Design a binder for this molecule. Sequence first.
Ligand code: OIK
Ligand code: OIK
Lengths: 304, 304
Amino acid sequence: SGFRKMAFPSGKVEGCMVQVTCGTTTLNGLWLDDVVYCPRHVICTSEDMLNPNYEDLLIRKSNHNFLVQAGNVQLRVIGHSMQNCVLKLKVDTANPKTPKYKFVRIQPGQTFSVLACYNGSPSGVYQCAMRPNFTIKGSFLNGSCGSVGFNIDYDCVSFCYMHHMELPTGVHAGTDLEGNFYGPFVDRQTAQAAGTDTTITVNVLAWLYAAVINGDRWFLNRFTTTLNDFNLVAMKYNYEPLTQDHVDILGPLSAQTGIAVLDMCASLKELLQNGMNGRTILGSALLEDEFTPFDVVRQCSGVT
Amino acid sequence: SGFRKMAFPSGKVEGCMVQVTCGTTTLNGLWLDDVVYCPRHVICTSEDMLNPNYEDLLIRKSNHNFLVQAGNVQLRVIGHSMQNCVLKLKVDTANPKTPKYKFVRIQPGQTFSVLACYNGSPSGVYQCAMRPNFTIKGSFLNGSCGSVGFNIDYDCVSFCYMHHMELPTGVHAGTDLEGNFYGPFVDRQTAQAAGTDTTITVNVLAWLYAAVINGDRWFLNRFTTTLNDFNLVAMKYNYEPLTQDHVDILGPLSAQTGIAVLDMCASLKELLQNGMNGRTILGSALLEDEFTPFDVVRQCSGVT
Ligand SMILES: O=C(c1cncc2ccccc12)N1CCN(c2ccccc2)CC1
Ligand SMILES: O=C(c1cncc2ccccc12)N1CCN(c2ccccc2)CC1
């Protein structure tokens, strides 16, 4: 028992982190096979932050201007290209530590682990969710760009995020590994609206199921509700509308606990309307939405 | 900016995880140099859980009864011995992935990362604190024994915890890497009192400093207090008494924010007496105590 915001083991990703420098700018890159992937804003200067012409900036750069270091050893760059907001630096050596991998564009509400890095060196690992508004609530400082988010399925690393920027509001934005930003964000030092962030209802319910499995049952009530009645409450509290697809995804947790999904919805409706009354659930005083139903089953089953 | 419960990158520890089986019992071991460390209760059966005589049980075991597997390959056991509550299995091969390491017995209130493992395979990584009552609030299932807690200082892994058991209350207990339990716990399937768990005051203050650094300042007030006045409040709320050593440790955070430690104490006193009033601090609705002042400086400075 016990429920923690667990991240995937980061070893397979640590073995891919390299440092990329262009001019005076240093950030992190991801070395997979003979390619190093990094945010294209590595080619920017102080005067090229508010409105960069990446195509024009990149034209002034040659292979030897991109310094890539893996640990203490220098990688030789034999090609460079821009794919959306990422640069792909072809190096003469395939990463010997390259794990089995995939590039995936995750759905909002899905979770992933982030390996925060500085100067190509890993500093820490944490679990987070892609918010419905396509931002992440990470922990990133200057130099963390190019740090990646990923999921692990047995031996395969699915890379889903590359860190590009911090919005003036302290939230984070970035791209998939094809360089396409999640959300409406652009790699420019301008004010950008993140948008209203809703609560991932299916994740809150999954966490309530985790709470029941882990002994926390005070919030369970004698009520039930309907999807339409529940959603009237969810709308009022800026919660994502729950659909039959979400109910179906909660099926295994509903079967394990013996609590019907609409019954758990009535517990959630009462918690929203009444608050926690100074009480806690899984060591938390607010409703947690950064655990998917898959994360709950995984943590409560011991998938390695 | 952003503040997350960050764990150390786990790669160096993943490379040390092995599976140990004795009879019908399988758990995890830690392979460092030519020794595999594991909980001694691996030699127990169902009838040897309530009151095991480890010395007598171990006498019926020979080297070939300990099956150690590193990935898919079998390790040859050439020696075995019991040191307190851990077994040390000497194998004929030194772990080629052995990192620079230390065995340390951590102080209550200090934090560490746990790499939860099953069958010698890592499942996840999370950060936790050694509670003042010498328990940990982990996430562990059957088969997780032998999973370890550690800290990383540049390239050196300081192992501080080995998982041994779950108390009937859902909290976790275990040993340092010399096999000495943290707290009064014994490796027996009997009811064991954990003791009153207090809140790590110096950690709550460190987290309040992290909140200020990360923009959350609503809780800051126009008041100050004294160590003795603060401790009268801390006692009432089952908080550890704050000492000058704790004030001195908060010195760098006090200097970075320009907020005197006793001024932050008055903010903490008011939060304890008045509650959060439905507000949050660093995405939390309760006062967080599992970040040390060192963790706050590290996360807010980017130590790799
Ligand atoms: O290293 C960072 C950064 C990232 N994440 C969190 C942070 C927190 C505080 C300070 C800086 C950061 N930046 C910020 C984006 N930046 C950039 C440059 C050109 C075009 C678009 C973006 C490059 C430098
Ligand atoms: O694998 C575990 C375990 C550990 N952590 C969390 C758990 C949650 C649910 C179920 C089991 C566990 N045990 C529990 C202790 N156990 C043991 C045997 C002899 C003497 C002393 C301890 C060996 C088997």
